[PDB]
Amino acid sequence: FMVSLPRMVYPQPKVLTPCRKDVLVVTPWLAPIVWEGTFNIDILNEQFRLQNTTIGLTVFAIKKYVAFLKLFLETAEKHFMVGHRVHYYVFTDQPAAVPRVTLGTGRQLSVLEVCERRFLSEVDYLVCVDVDTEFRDHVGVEILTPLFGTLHPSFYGSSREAFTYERRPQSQAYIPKDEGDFYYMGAFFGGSVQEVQRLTRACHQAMMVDQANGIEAVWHDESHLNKYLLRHKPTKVLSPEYLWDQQLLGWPAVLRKLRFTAVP
Ligand SMILES: [Hg+2]
Ligand SMILES: [Hg+2]
Ligand SMILES: [Hg+2]
Ligand SMILES: [Hg+2]
Ligand SMILES: [Hg+2]
């Protein structure tokens, strides 16, 4: 059950003015593609806060990657889901090396040394990112939906034939040259707990089949994510605002905000 929104004063949507004339803002299966200028964050914040939404943020930090945690978490505190309940899950081989970062109210961190059902009772949504990154701008409830992938910054303007999908038919990740919507990046996906567990279960089984068959997909996890998201369309797609690489790719006019980035 969803309670009424309160009175709010904001600009009227303009039916005869497009959000963007430079980019696609809806997929052919009518999922929004999230770019700056498409959403009113006040509206979305109200909707998600009224549902007392909790977001889980999962990172795997093994060996030398533990060194990235301090910047990752400090910047998450500044930019990720601020105002909402957040639960960080840091999966590491070095629990004592996790930095002691100060968290805002309503935000908590669990260190798990390297199950599943723990997530279903603790959070509403799971967001799965790489830890060698930092937040630079708002990443909020506008991303939340049953299942989302993010447009890989090197491929968003590419034709499908140029996508680095797995191309050998012997791999469970195979996608032929006449298939594919987008090239999603392995480093930033998420959704409801139930849908993220579906995805990771599917990719885990496909990867075991490939291993039994003597084949390893070209981009590993990412190749299988792309196969999954081809066959199970995401309910939102995030623009490359959401995982950019300024060193490799600069700051093109199409990007109004650079929200989350690879550390150089
Ligand atoms: Hg708009
Ligand atoms: Hg995850
Ligand atoms: Hg998969
Ligand atoms: Hg996997
Ligand atoms: Hg996957």
Swiss-Prot record:
Positions contributing to Mn(2+) binding: D130, D132
Enzyme Commission numbers on file: 2.4.1.40, 2.4.1.37
Effect after changing G149R: In group B transferase; lower-level protein expression and intracellular cytoplasmic mislocation
Primary location class: Golgi
Cofactor: Mn(2+)
Catalytic site positions: E222
Modifications after synthesis and translation: The soluble form derives from the membrane form by proteolytic processing.
Tissue/organ expression: Expressed at high levels in testis. Also expressed in pancreas, uterus and lung and salivary gland.
Substitution effect: D210N: In allele B104
Residue sites binding an alpha-L-fucosyl-(1->2)-beta-D-galactosyl derivative per the record: H152, T164, E222, D245
Residue numbers binding UDP-N-acetyl-alpha-D-galactosamine: F60, A61, I62, Y65, D130, V131, D132
Keywords: Blood group antigen, Glycoprotein, Glycosyltransferase, Golgi apparatus, Manganese, Membrane, Metal-binding, Secreted, Signal-anchor, Transferase, Transmembrane, Transmembrane helix
Lumenal side: 3-264
Catalyzed reaction equations: an alpha-L-fucosyl-(1->2)-beta-D-galactosyl derivative + UDP-N-acetyl-alpha-D-galactosamine = an N-acetyl-alpha-D-galactosaminyl-(1->3)-[alpha-L-fucosyl-(1->2)]-beta-D-galactosyl derivative + UDP + H(+); an alpha-L-fucosyl-(1->2)-beta-D-galactosyl derivative + UDP-alpha-D-galactose = an alpha-D-galactosyl-(1->3)-[alpha-L-fucosyl-(1->2)]-beta-D-galactosyl derivative + UDP + H(+)
Pathway recorded for this protein: Protein modification; protein glycosylation
Membrane protein topology class: Single-pass type II membrane protein
Protein's GO biological process: carbohydrate metabolic process; lipid glycosylation; protein glycosylation
Family statement drawn from the similarity comment of this UniProt entry: Belongs to the glycosyltransferase 6 family.
This protein's domain notes: The conserved DXD motif is involved in cofactor binding. The manganese ion interacts with the beta-phosphate group of UDP and may also have a role in catalysis.
Stated name of the protein: Histo-blood group ABO system transferase
Organism: Homo sapiens
